[PDB]
Structures are given as structure tokens and as C-alpha cells.
Amino acid sequence: SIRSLGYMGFAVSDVAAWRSFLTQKLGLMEAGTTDNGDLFRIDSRAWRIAVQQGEVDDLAFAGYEVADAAGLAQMADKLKQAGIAVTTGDASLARRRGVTGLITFADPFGLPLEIYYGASEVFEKPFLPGAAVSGFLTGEQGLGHFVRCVPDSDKALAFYTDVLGFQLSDVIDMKMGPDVTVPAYFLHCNERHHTLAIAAFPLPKRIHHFMLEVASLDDVGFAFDRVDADGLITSTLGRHTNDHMVSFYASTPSGVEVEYGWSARTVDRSWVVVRHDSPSMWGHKSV
Amino acid sequence: SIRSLGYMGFAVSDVAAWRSFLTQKLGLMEAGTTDNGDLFRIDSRAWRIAVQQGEVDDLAFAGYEVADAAGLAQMADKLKQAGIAVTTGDASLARRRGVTGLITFADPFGLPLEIYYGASEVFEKPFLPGAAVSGFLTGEQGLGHFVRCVPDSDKALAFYTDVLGFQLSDVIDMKMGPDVTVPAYFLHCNERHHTLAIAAFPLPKRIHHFMLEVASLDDVGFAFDRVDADGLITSTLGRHTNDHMVSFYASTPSGVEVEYGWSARTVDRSWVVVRHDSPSMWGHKSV
Amino acid sequence: SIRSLGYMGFAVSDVAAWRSFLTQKLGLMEAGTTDNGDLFRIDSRAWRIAVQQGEVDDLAFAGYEVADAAGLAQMADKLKQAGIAVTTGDASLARRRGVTGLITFADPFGLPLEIYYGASEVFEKPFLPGAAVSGFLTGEQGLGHFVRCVPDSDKALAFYTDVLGFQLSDVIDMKMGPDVTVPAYFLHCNERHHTLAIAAFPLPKRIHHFMLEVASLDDVGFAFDRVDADGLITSTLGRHTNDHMVSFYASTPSGVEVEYGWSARTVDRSWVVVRHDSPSMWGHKSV
Amino acid sequence: SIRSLGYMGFAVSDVAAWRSFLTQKLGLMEAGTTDNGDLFRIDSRAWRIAVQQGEVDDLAFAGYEVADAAGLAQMADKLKQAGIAVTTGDASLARRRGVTGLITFADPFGLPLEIYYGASEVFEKPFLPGAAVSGFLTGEQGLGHFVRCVPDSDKALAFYTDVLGFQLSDVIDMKMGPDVTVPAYFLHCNERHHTLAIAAFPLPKRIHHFMLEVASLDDVGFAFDRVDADGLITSTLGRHTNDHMVSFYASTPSGVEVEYGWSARTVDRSWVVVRHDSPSMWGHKSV
Amino acid sequence: SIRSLGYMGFAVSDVAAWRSFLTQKLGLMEAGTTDNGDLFRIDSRAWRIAVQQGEVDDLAFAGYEVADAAGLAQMADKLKQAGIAVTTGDASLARRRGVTGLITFADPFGLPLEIYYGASEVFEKPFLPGAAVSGFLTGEQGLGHFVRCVPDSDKALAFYTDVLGFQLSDVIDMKMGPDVTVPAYFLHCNERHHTLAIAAFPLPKRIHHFMLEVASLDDVGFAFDRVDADGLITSTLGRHTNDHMVSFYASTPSGVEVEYGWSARTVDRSWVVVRHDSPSMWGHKSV
Amino acid sequence: SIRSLGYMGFAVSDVAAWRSFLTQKLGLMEAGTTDNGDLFRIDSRAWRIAVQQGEVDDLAFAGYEVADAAGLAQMADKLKQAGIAVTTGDASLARRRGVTGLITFADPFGLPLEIYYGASEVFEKPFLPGAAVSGFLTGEQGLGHFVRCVPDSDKALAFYTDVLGFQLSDVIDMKMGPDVTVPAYFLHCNERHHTLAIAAFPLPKRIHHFMLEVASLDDVGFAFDRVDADGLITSTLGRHTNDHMVSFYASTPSGVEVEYGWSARTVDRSWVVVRHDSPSMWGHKSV
Ligand SMILES: Oc1cccc(-c2ccccc2Cl)c1O
Ligand SMILES: Oc1cccc(-c2ccccc2Cl)c1O
Ligand SMILES: Oc1cccc(-c2ccccc2Cl)c1O
Ligand SMILES: Oc1cccc(-c2ccccc2Cl)c1O
Ligand SMILES: Oc1cccc(-c2ccccc2Cl)c1O
Ligand SMILES: Oc1cccc(-c2ccccc2Cl)c1O
Ligand SMILES: Oc1cccc(-c2ccccc2Cl)c1O
Ligand SMILES: Oc1cccc(-c2ccccc2Cl)c1O
Ligand SMILES: Oc1cccc(-c2ccccc2Cl)c1O
Ligand SMILES: Oc1cccc(-c2ccccc2Cl)c1O
Ligand SMILES: Oc1cccc(-c2ccccc2Cl)c1O
Ligand SMILES: Oc1cccc(-c2ccccc2Cl)c1O
Ligand SMILES: [Fe+2]
Ligand SMILES: [Fe+2]
Ligand SMILES: [Fe+2]
Ligand SMILES: [Fe+2]
Ligand SMILES: [Fe+2]
Ligand SMILES: [Fe+2]
Ligand SMILES: [Fe+2]
Ligand SMILES: [Fe+2]
Ligand SMILES: [Fe+2]
Ligand SMILES: [Fe+2]
Ligand SMILES: [Fe+2]
Ligand SMILES: [Fe+2]
């Protein structure tokens, strides 16, 4: 079974702007440049985010991690049985991603996805943030989460749950307008409240935002100010109703947003699905 | 499987008296009025207790919570296979209860029951008790418990255990008189020692009492005095022999009682069924 | 499955001597006299040890506790399938033992055994030791343990493990003499290192000793002196090699011994079977 | 299933040198001499390492521990079904090893292996290190680990995983030279990150090294100096990238090395396989 | 002010017997031989007990530790003002004791005493007990205690309290016989309940016993057996009424006894003086 | 009274080499350049180490921190009463150091010293190490320590203790050669075992080394490798006998060394002065 979101790749028009944004604003660590693009780290892994030159300015691919070769084989079989076109990653791609083995395919609406096992650790190159950040929260919870924008949430939900195995945490009926309410589905694959969210938002991108979690409230507070200095804040500090994360949102150079948060609650086998009519307990004012 | 008791609805002759009793005496929070009646809260849920106008002055319905849609479907199948008439809650009822989906049916002796999933949370409307109460204990243990009065405890026990899946915690042979001893069965569906009790008591109501648990001994002590001021106490402070809860009992405006307690022990998979000849270790004197 | 040793009954020639020994020396609580004999307590249960008048001066019966009625039914079936003569305890016997249901049978060498569920708790009659004892250790670990003396340990081991479900903890090859070594088997049915031990000792009784565990080292130290005052000590203070319990042994009025200890280690699913050539790390000198 | 590495036997040309090295340098306890050779202890077990006279100067055999007789029988069946020649250890061998039962066989490349149950504990002969060592870490993690040198790691990996049941923790691609990279596989059978490692190293021995873990950093620091005084250090203090153990390596009298470490992290069912390009985060400089 | 008892020297007729007794029986560490006699350690200090050849077979001297040079000067002045003959330890004596500075004098009844500062630590020669002992308790509590036998306890008490600054912990009126009761005074100079005791016992030595405290009950239990094997035990295991130490007593080769214990309670500025009529809560039977 | 060592200034011939060494090797944070020279941080303070251009290549000045203005006035009076020439720092110097007030003077052998109060904090410019360092240990313990080299340790000791108020922790008689032993004095002014050490070493500098303490063993391990890559290590990893710090030593561009350590023990009012014959328990081999 999928254990977590392991990495993400972005294809952007301004690579230098993304490099500055990720390191100086968010605190990620520059981890070199390879055929996989410019690499960035947040922990012991060789890389978590890759930035490649591309006019799409959006998420180019996402990789989900399984525990071992057997787990990869099981997921491959499930995808094929579901009628999805699955391709074994060649040696060239595996080396590019720094993984031992992987398979590639696309979700119902075209997002290129990868499931891999045996990623590269680089403990001998100790993590050093590009900005003052006490640390990022990963471990068994993976990289963080992203919100997939789709035209048919029922179809997307069925794929991610029935085929990929994600489990529903809760639903938030997002008020878009007096006569517009759209359900946002939050799904987990480990203890992180959600690793993936699905919603039918009117955005011209594959995702609304990706999220990175830090270890202290100060990490979030300082980052907010670094981002605010350039007028990139899109939402003030607030705490979510479902995962109880304290965070803020900001614009990346591609328009797609990034959420930066701290202190979210986790889920367990005793969790029960619920619904909400608001995404925030307090704060998160649109600015 | 059923995870907990999620909500209760009462049909009463004096709605204003119940509103005052629940808020000023017990400390519940007024949560508005809808087609579901006057709503009251004790935690993050949109409502836990509803009060509607009705001459019955008794419990009108109770809702048990399952983890998700799959759990609701499984319970529906079990009930049908057992020969119980099950009805899918229509969109109108689901909206009234603020749940995502639910089924309705009645227990062997006419109590309307509902099993639902996906109830509404309102973290954005922080809980504020109507009286000085540090907090109510809910979470994975649900709302609390109620004691179902029936004419045939063996039949009721079989339904709640064999069909609904409740598990026996223990039995207390209640001395009613020199030649009258009635067994009271205490059942659990989660860590709470009991979410439901069953006994053949000579009462003209569906339940003898419902119980709410608070976070501190002082919450109980102060509440006792607020209730005692109006001469509504039915039992002095005491601690039960089975769940070890420290509580007192009082009369609601409908005659049906309410138990208000603190510090009960929980049960686990290592629990063994036992019997008792007394319901109280100390206190709980009838007054 | 059997969850623990729940009670023991002794048939003795000097009932008054046993009453004095259990209360004044060991600290048990006198719990009245019924058709079940004189009753003694060590915790919240109505009784753990019964003493009846009888010329045998030995263990008369032992009762093993199961979790519920279903567990009793399962054990009954296993015993019958194994060819053992099983008898349903009549209402008269159940009332005598204060249990809800029970079955009776004998082990391969004649020891009367009982398996029951739903024993009586008496929290309303708070435990008060007959001597200065901070408390006895029971709970999920039951009453303690006893060592069954048999002429064929292989046959006894097969019955208790294959039929009753006990699991082997370890073996101690007891040096009886230059040319005599006898294996003692220690078996568990819960976290207590052993609830039953089996050995082919040259003793004219069904058991060599029964053991009760207390909460503090002082409980053991004080008890040792109370017993030593009457010259009843059989072994000095020592700590066992297998369960690491610190204890001493003494003679009951029936010759059969009693072990009184503190601080034993428990076992879990990660436990591995081992062997020992000595029963004591230190102490336990024969006196 | 195999629960841990329980013991190791070495056949050496200089028995006196090994005795001095194990006791004075590493701190093991001399535990007598039997037909099993000179015995050495690190904990409550009668012995963990045996040294016999032999011109091979290498590991002579290794014993893996199972939980009980049933576990031994299961492993025997698995080995036979896999086509491996299995021999039941005779009474003479069992007594020599101090175990209750065992089976013998060889791995694909000739290493004599044994799987046993019921080893001997000697708590009555309290462990006393031969040098200043606060303690060795064993328990459920067993003796420690050793690295098996083989000519075909794929074949060895298949045997140890598919037949013996070991599980992969991670892989380290060891840089041997500009055009030489060899994968080292680290496998676990309990919480210890690895109990066995497999690699195709150009060494004329069955193993590159065996490892013993101690309780404090000082235990390692002091040992380093005792070994360094005789010029036997092969690697300076360092911390590994995979198990995060802080250790140093040194030469035994047989050339085969020994790793002495502290503070390694453990693995659980939530562990995911990863890869590394370096075996050390810091230190471990070849000297 | 005096901070603790730092060391003791014994003059014995059988030096080899004392060496064997201290190391093999009690677990002290042999620390070489100098002009100060044979040295023994129990912790990081270069030595705590010295054994010299002498026909007296008794305590030859005791050294009390002060915090620094200023503290030594203050004590010297207090002793002189009290009329005691004080001598500055010459360079030769300081080197012999391994201290920076010291003064010498005798108590009212001839016991040679020394007060010093700046003793030698030897952390680079890690403590290794001569027997299986997890550790000795020293630190701010010093070496342990000894009981000074005197013909006039009032005179001795006045000297140790008024001149040396010891403080009374409690008094035990020791029953020597039907018409003989002698008060034993227990005094502290730090957190240890007592570092010195004073009593008028009919013994031909300067002290009745000296005491060493260990870290675990097992340390005491194992030591008891090592001593008992040679028939040297003088008192069975017991716990004292005043300091609550669990210990046993044994004979040294000089007749003077040694107490070996564990788990004593400490004293603070909130301590109040009390009296006892017995020295033991349980145990400590004369054998 | 002096509360801690607050800052140090170095006058060096190669400012660029020092900048690279402090940031890339040790992990300090570049904090700008002012008339105070290039500034470096290790915590919330605006600066802890300053580097100015100067041919001396040695410590140029050190600043000790007092709690407030009253404390500065008290120290000024003590110095004057002792006959030391004290100068009030002018507004220009205070601004240069970023302090509220300070006085200047020299120790007996020419080292320029300063005592100040009210230094500048810059929490709004969160600390970001120049290398992978989890953190430096400062707080109430100040910057760390340095070892003052002098021709007459008795004279220096008298000044620092009698005039500045430092307190002796312990003494280590350093073996320089067969006929050369020099005492090193370690002094504290807060919980740090030593903030200053004094010794008569044959070095052409004011100090032998300064020391910085980090939060993890890995911080030290990684730093060791960064320094070793340039062949600057002077001592291997080891642990000191007196403060028990685990550290290594390396050469700065000025020849003067730097000690980088972790896990030292602290001192309290219960501390007693002792002596040692070795500075290291293990390691610290000269290379
Ligand atoms: O806040 C946002 C989240 C995701 C995508 C866009 C976006 C990006 C490019 C062009 C237009 C839009 Cl709305 C955006 O503004
Ligand atoms: O992590 C989250 C938890 C709850 C709600 C949102 C959210 C908020 C605004 C727009 C879209 C989303 Cl998915 C969110 O990003
Ligand atoms: O204590 C009680 C618990 C449950 C029901 C009633 C009741 C309510 C109305 C009329 C008569 C009775 Cl006994 C009651 O008095
Ligand atoms: O929570 C409880 C635990 C044990 C006993 C009772 C009780 C007490 C009196 C009458 C009816 C009942 Cl169910 C009870 O309400
Ligand atoms: O220590 C003992 C344990 C069990 C039984 C007897 C016993 C009891 C009665 C007669 C003879 C004997 Cl050996 C006994 O002495
Ligand atoms: O609880 C125990 C643990 C280990 C050994 C014995 C023991 C000791 C002496 C004789 C018989 C037995 Cl079972 C014992 O009673
Ligand atoms: O470091 C080593 C690890 C394992 C084996 C040998 C060895 C032993 C004997 C002869 C030659 C060699 Cl390379 C060795 O030197
Ligand atoms: O315990 C270990 C963890 C990671 C790597 C090695 C290692 C290091 C050098 C050579 C061979 C090996 Cl297996 C190792 O011994
Ligand atoms: O138990 C004892 C404690 C202290 C001293 C002696 C002793 C020693 C030598 C000769 C006579 C006696 Cl009583 C002793 O026997
Ligand atoms: O440490 C102790 C605490 C209390 C009492 C005694 C004691 C016991 C017997 C004889 C002499 C003494 Cl001082 C003792 O040694
Ligand atoms: O290790 C050292 C510590 C302090 C000073 C010097 C030093 C610096 C410059 C010239 C000569 C020397 Cl010995 C040095 O080498
Ligand atoms: O922090 C320390 C603790 C103990 C000893 C030394 C030391 C070691 C070598 C040379 C000079 C000194 Cl001050 C040291 O720097
Ligand atoms: Fe989000
Ligand atoms: Fe889940
Ligand atoms: Fe109740
Ligand atoms: Fe249950
Ligand atoms: Fe026993
Ligand atoms: Fe088991
Ligand atoms: Fe290793
Ligand atoms: Fe595993
Ligand atoms: Fe004593
Ligand atoms: Fe005191
Ligand atoms: Fe230093
Ligand atoms: Fe001090």
C-alpha cells in the first residue's frame, strides 16, 4: 500500500524565481542540479521537490512511496486490474529520481503519477535550511500534501480511494458564492490528516496548493514575514477546522499557492468521517 | 460497526423549561433552533441533544455513529438480515440531523433509532458552556449513555448485542424490594464502560436516565448545587461499583432523570464480564 | 480462552488455624462464611480463597476465569472434543461460587477444576487487609499461581497446554540430588510469568505451594517476620531466576506451602522459551 | 519465525589471544570452558560467543533463536521444502550448546548455521564484564549482527529472505573504487536495524565483522582506547547512515574485524526500504 | 563545613584476607598499592578505603571532606578555638592521601581524624567492581557511614556536633538486655541520613561497623550469598526504622563488621528529630 | 557579580580565512560588519565573536557580562579598591559593542578585558548557522570558555578569583614531560563547569584555545569531518575528566586553537574542588 507522498516535480517558466522563493522564503535546502532539474530538500532525503524549466508553471508529477519491491508490485497489479495503463520506470528514470524501482501512470485527469520504493537518503550531507527554520515535519507522514483540482470530484475520489487506496478523513463544503458550494475531500494514507485533497475549484492548474509543515510556530511566523515583504501572502495566519493546522498561504512564482503550517493533529484507525461548513476555525482571511 | 452514541432527541411538553435546565443547570450550549428543534452542544459537534415540542416527555430518538459510508451499509445489511425494517434517511432528514447519510429503524420495543455517518463539526463556533463547566468528555467515547427500560431484558439484550453489536461489560442485580431483584445489563461499543444499559424497571418512559460526563470533580460539585437549589436532586453524590463514575442524579422537566458524572474507568479488549449486587460503592443515597 | 486463575478452595483439618494464618500472617481479609466455606479476599472480588473442613489438608479445587459466556462455551467444547468428562455447574454451585456460569471437570491426575465467567465484585465492601499489607497484585494477572505435583509431567504438560491453552514460559531443571534432576515447567495464560507450574516432586499433596503477590517489598518483609515468629519459614528471602520475583516460602497448617512475593517481571508475545539450572538468583535458602 | 541471532562460534589459531582480546579489550565475561570451547558472555545467557582451536581463523557457526519447539519445527519444514539438507541436532550437540532443541544446516555458501530454542540462562551467575563496560544491549534484539561475505549477493539475499525470513531494512552501494561499487544489504528479524548484512567483498573470510552494542558512549570511548593502545583500530569513531550507530572497528586476532557501538535506532512495521551511497554520516575514517 | 566522609584507613593483621573480602565479597575495585597501603575504590575517586598492615585490626583513621581551601581553614580555626591540637598535614602525607591539603587531629577518644580538600579523581581509569555490583552510591553523600563506639556518648556527641558541625537525625534506644538500654545517635553532614553514628557499645574496637551503599536490591542479594558461603553473615536482610535502608551485616577479617545496603531515604532542612525503640522495621535477625 | 563570558574579539592577519573557518567549518552565523569588525553569532545576541584586522593573530579582548548597571558599578568599585586602572567605556565604545554600559581594564598580564551590561538581542533576525549545526549552548552559561596562558598562574588565579570573583572548580596537573608538570586551574562564574582556565603553557599567545558548545553529538561529529578535510584537527574526539565534555580541538587561522564540544556536566553550590592527573577520560589523542 502507498505509505506517503514522497516527492513532487514542478515545471516552471522562471526557475531562478522558484530557487529564490523555496530557499530564501520557505527555507528549503538547495541540493544540486541534475537531469532531474534543480533539487531541493527539507530533510534527510536526497530531494523532495524538483524544479524544471517548463512553460506550464504547474505540478509536473508527484511520487507516492511504497514500503518495498513487493508493495510496488502489488500496486502495479491493482492499477492494471483497474484498467490503468502502467509503465515500468526504466533504469534512466529510476536513476533520475534516485529510487530503486518505480512505475508510472496518470490519474483520471492527466496528472502524471509515480509510485516508487527505495529512495535515496543523504544523512552524510546534513540538512541545512536556506532560511531560519527549526525543521520540517516529515518522517512517516511524508512530504506534506497537495490539493488536486478536478472537473469531477466523484470520479477523482473513486480513483484515489478505490484504486490507490487513500482513505477519507473528512469533507468540507466550501462556500464559493451565494449559489455555489463545492465539496472538498481530504484523504489520508498514513497518520497525516491528509496527504491529498480533491475539489472542483475554478483554477487553471492541476493543484491549488502544496503544503509543507514545520516544527515550530516561530518557523511559520518568520516565514510569513519573509513572504509578506514581497507582497506574496494570499491568506493571513489561521487554523483549519479539520486538521487543526496553523498556517498561512502564499503565491509561488507560478501562481499556484503554497501553504506553510504547524501543529496539525493526526488520524488513527479510530478516526470517524465528519463534515464541515468552513475550512478555518479562525484567521485565514483572504488578502 | 457502531462506534458511539452520537446524539439524542427529546420530545417535551415544556421546551422553555428544558432550555433553562440544560443550559443554566447542566451547562450545555444553546446552538440555535432549526427544523430539528432547539439544539444543544457539549463539544465541537453542531449538536448532541435536540429538544422538540411534544406531549410524550421522553426520549424521541437516538442516533448511533458509524465510521463511514461502508460502515453504514454493513449495519444496514445486518439489520435487514435480522428481519428488521430499515429505511434510508431521505435528504430532508439527513439535512435536519446535519449528517451525510443515515438509516432509521426501531428497537424491539418501539424506540426510534438511527445509525449515521459524517456528522457536522463546528470548530469555527467554539464551545462555550451555559454554566461554569470546564468541559465535557466525549471524543471516541461519544455523548455518554442512557438506560433503556424494557419489559423483557433478555429480548432487548439479544437485539442490542446480536444485531447492533454492543458488548457486555457487566451485570448488576438491582434490589428493588425484598422479593424483587432485576438484572441491569451494561453494554459498551467503545472505551466508555457503557454507552447503553438495559433493565426491566417499572417506569412509564423509554429510559430511566441519560448521562453526561464532565472533566472535573468541581464541574459535578457546582452542578449539584445549581440543581439542588431548585430541589431537583434525586440521588446524592456517589461512585458506581462498575464504571467507578462519581456522579449524582436529578430530575429533568420530563420526569426522566439525568446523571452528571466524572472520572469513570474505561474498558479494553482485556476486560472480563463480572456481576455486582449493588450499583454504588458509596453515596448515591435516594433523596 | 482462559484469562487467569480466579479462585482456589482448600479442604483442611484445622479451619481455625487456616483462618488465623491467612488473616494475621498473610494479611487476607475475612469475607464471611457461606456454604462455600470460610471466604477470604485479597482484592475487590467477593472471595479468592475458600477454606472448608476436610481431612485431606490440600487444594480441593481451582477455578480458571474466562471473559464471558461465549468463552466458557468454547472451552467446554474443547474439553469435550479432547475426551474429557465435562459437567455444567448447576444453579446451586454457581450461587455457591458467586459466579454466573461454570463447568466442572478434573485434570489427568484427579484435581477438580472449574472454568467460570461472571464472578462477583464487592467494591461496596472495600478491601481491608487482616495485617499490614499495602495491597495485593491481581487485576488482569489473576490470583497468583500454584505448582501442581504430578507423577508424569509430560502428560500433565500436554493437558494444560493442548487442552486448556496454557503457554510455556520456561523450564527449570531442579536438582533434587546427585542422581536426581526433575524438570519444572512454568506456564502462563496472561501477563503473569506463570499462573501454573508443573513438576514431578515427591510430595503427598496435589500442590507444593500457591503464591500471592504483594505491592511492596515491605509487605513481604513484614510478613516474613510475622511468619518467622511462629517458626513457619521454609525458605529465606530470595529472587527467582525466571520470573524475578522476590519472595519467601512458609508452611500453611496443611503442610502445603505458600509463597509470598513482590516485583516479578511479566511476559509478552515477544517472550522466548528458555531453560535454567537453578530456581533462585540469590537467597531462598532452605531453613 | 527466527527471533534473533543468539550465538556465534569462532575457530581460531590463537585461543589465548582471543581470550585476552574479548575480555580485556571488549569487556566480555569469561564463562568457563566446555566441549563447546572457551565460552564468553555479555548478558544473562550462559554464553554468546564460543572460541575453539582451529586453523581457519573465522566464524565457525552461528545460531539463530526461535521462540519455542513449534517455531523450530516450522523453520525445519520451510528449509526442507526449500530443498535444504536439514539435520536434527543430537542430544550431544544440544547439551554442548546448552539448548533444548536445534537443527543444523548450511547457507548457500557453506556457513554452518543452527536454529535453536530454549537456550540456558544463568541469572544466578551475575554478569561481570572483563573490562569497564556499563552493559551490553541484547534482550529482544539478540547478540548483535555480522556481515556475511559472499560471491553472489543476489543468491544469498534470496536464501536469507525467502527461506530464513529475514526482512530488508536498506541498501548501501559501497564505493570500493572508481569502477567498483558493491551493494550491501542490511536485514532485520526483530527491532535491531540489522542482525545480518550481505555483501560481495573481496575478503578471504566468511564475515567481514561481527558487532556488539553497548549501553553508553563512554563504553565505546574507553574500549576504543584499550584497542588503540595495541594498534588494532581499523576505523575511527563514526556514526552510520542507516542504523545511526556510533561505533569504531578493530582487528581481532583472526583478521576478521569487530564493530563496537552505541545508540543505534531501531525499526518497526512502519519502516520503508531506502538506499544510501555512503555507510557513514561522519567519522569511520580508515586508519 | 564538612561535606562528607571521604575515606577510611584500616590497619589489619591479615592484609590478604581483607583484599579478598573487599573485592570478591563486597565488589570493591583493587586500585594499586602505595605508601598509603593497598587501595580500594567504589567510584571515580582514586581510593576510598586503604588497608595497611597492623596488629590493631580496626579503623586506623577517617577523612572528612570540605569543599575547598577556605573550608579547611575555617574548620582548622574552629578546632583550635575549641582547644583541639591540630596539625597541618605535610606534603608527604598529602601526597600519600592524594589530596591537595589536609589537617590532622584526634577525636575525644583517640580516633585519628583528618579533614581535607581537593582529593584525586581518576575518571580515566573507569571503575570496574571486583564482583557483580551495578554500582555504589556516593556522590554528594560521600562514602557511607560508620558507627563510633565510645565510653561516653554525651561527650562524643558534643564534639561531633558542636566542634565538627554534624547534625542530629534521630536517636534509637538500643535494648541490650532487660536492664540495659543504650542510646545510639545518628548524625548527618549532607543528604545521607547518617554519615556517623555514636553509641556506647561493649566492643573492643573504635567502630562497630562501616557501611557501603549499592544501587540495586540485587547487588545486596548477591553479596549476601557470597558472604554467606563463607559463614560470615551476622544479620539477615532487614530494613532500618530510621534511614529505611535495606541491608545485611557481615564480619570482616578484623571482627569489625560491614553493613551492605540499598534504598535508604535522605534528609533535608525540613527534617525533624525523632526517637525509636527498635533499629529494624523487619529482618536483621542476629545469626 | 560577573554572570558569564559574553563576547570575544580577535585581531587576525587573515580576516577572510577566519570568516570561512567560523562559518563553513564551525557553523557560526555571519552577522554583518561594523566598526567593531566582522561580527559572528551563535545565538540570539547581535554578536558573540568579532574579527578585526591585526597582525597579532590572537585574542584582542574579552567581555564579561553583569546583570545590570548596579552590578557594573559594584565590579568597578572592586577593581579600583584592588588598585586596578579602570576606565569607563565612552559612548562610542558602548555603541561599537552594542552594550548599554561598560568599563575597561587589563588583567595582570596585559589581556584587555571589559565588563558590561545590557547587550543587544536580535530575535527579529533569527539565528541561521553557517553550517549544519542543530544549535549552540549558551543561555545562562554564556558563550563558552577560553584558556588563559600566563607566566605565573598563582598571580593570575589570585586576580581572577579575589578581584573578578571567579570560583575554582578543579585542578588538573598537566604532564608536559618527564620533568615538567603544570597545574591548570578551571574556574566558574555560573553553571558552566568552567568559563575560564588558567595555565602556564609555553605558547606565544594569550590563550591556548576558546571553546564553543553545541547541542548534539552529531553537531560535533559533522564539524570534526569538515575541519579534518582541511587537515586542521589537533586532537581526536575525546571526553574530559573534569567537565565531561565530549569534544575535539582544531587550529584556527591564527594558530590559536578552538575546542568544539557537547554534553558537559554543570556545577552547583554543592560542588567540591578536586584534582586530576589527566585531562581526558578517553580520546583526545594528539594528531
Ligand atoms: O491562487 C491560485 C491558485 C492556483 C492557481 C492560480 C492561477 C495561476 C495562473 C493563472 C491564473 C490562476 Cl487563477 C492561482 O491564482
Ligand atoms: O489543508 C487544508 C485544510 C482545510 C482546508 C483547506 C483549504 C482552504 C481553502 C481552499 C482550499 C483548501 Cl483545500 C486546506 O488547504
Ligand atoms: O425518576 C424517574 C425516571 C424515569 C421516569 C419517571 C417518571 C416520569 C413521569 C411519570 C412517572 C414517572 Cl415514575 C421518573 O420519576
Ligand atoms: O451509570 C450507572 C452505573 C451503575 C448503575 C447505574 C444505575 C443506578 C440506579 C438505577 C439504574 C442504574 Cl442503570 C448507573 O446509572
Ligand atoms: O513442604 C511441603 C510441601 C507440600 C507438602 C508437604 C507435606 C504435607 C504433609 C505431609 C508430608 C509433606 Cl512432605 C510439605 O512438607
Ligand atoms: O515461583 C517460582 C519460580 C521459580 C521456581 C520456583 C520453585 C522453587 C522451589 C521448588 C519449586 C518451585 Cl516451582 C517457584 O515457586
Ligand atoms: O579487515 C579484514 C576483515 C576480514 C578479513 C580480513 C583478512 C583476514 C586474514 C587474511 C586477509 C584478510 Cl584481508 C581482514 O583484514
Ligand atoms: O553496521 C553497519 C552499518 C552500515 C555500514 C556498515 C559497513 C561499513 C563498512 C564496511 C562494511 C559494512 Cl557492512 C556497517 O557495518
Ligand atoms: O561484631 C563485632 C563488631 C565489632 C568488634 C567485634 C570484635 C572484634 C574482635 C574481638 C572481639 C569483638 Cl567483640 C565484633 O565481633
Ligand atoms: O545504619 C543503621 C541504622 C539504624 C541502626 C543501626 C544499628 C543496628 C544494630 C547495631 C548498631 C547500629 Cl548503629 C544501623 O547500623
Ligand atoms: O596549538 C597552539 C595553541 C596556541 C598557540 C599556538 C601557536 C601560534 C602561533 C605560533 C606558534 C604557536 Cl605554538 C599553537 O600552535
Ligand atoms: O575544557 C578542558 C577541560 C579539561 C582540560 C582541557 C585542556 C586539555 C589540553 C590542554 C589544555 C587544556 Cl585547558 C580543556 O580544554
Ligand atoms: Fe492545505
Ligand atoms: Fe484510516
Ligand atoms: Fe448511569
Ligand atoms: Fe469489548
Ligand atoms: Fe512459586
Ligand atoms: Fe504467550
Ligand atoms: Fe556493522
Ligand atoms: Fe519488518
Ligand atoms: Fe549502619
Ligand atoms: Fe540538617
Ligand atoms: Fe577547553
Ligand atoms: Fe561555586
Swiss-Prot record, chains A, B, C, D, E, F:
Query: Which residues constitute the signal peptide according to the record?
Result: none
**Record-linked PROSITE patterns:** EXTRADIOL_DIOXYGENAS, VOC
Which Gene Ontology BP terms does the record give? xenobiotic catabolic process
What catalytic activity is recorded? biphenyl-2,3-diol + O2 = 2-hydroxy-6-oxo-6-phenylhexa-2,4-dienoate + H(+)
Entry note: cofactor: Binds 1 Fe(2+) ion per subunit.
This molecule's function is given as:
Shows a preference for catechols with groups immediately adjacent to the hydroxyl substituents.
Report the family membership: Belongs to the extradiol ring-cleavage dioxygenase family.
The name on file for this protein is Biphenyl-2,3-diol 1,2-dioxygenase
Record the organism: Paraburkholderia xenovorans (strain LB400)
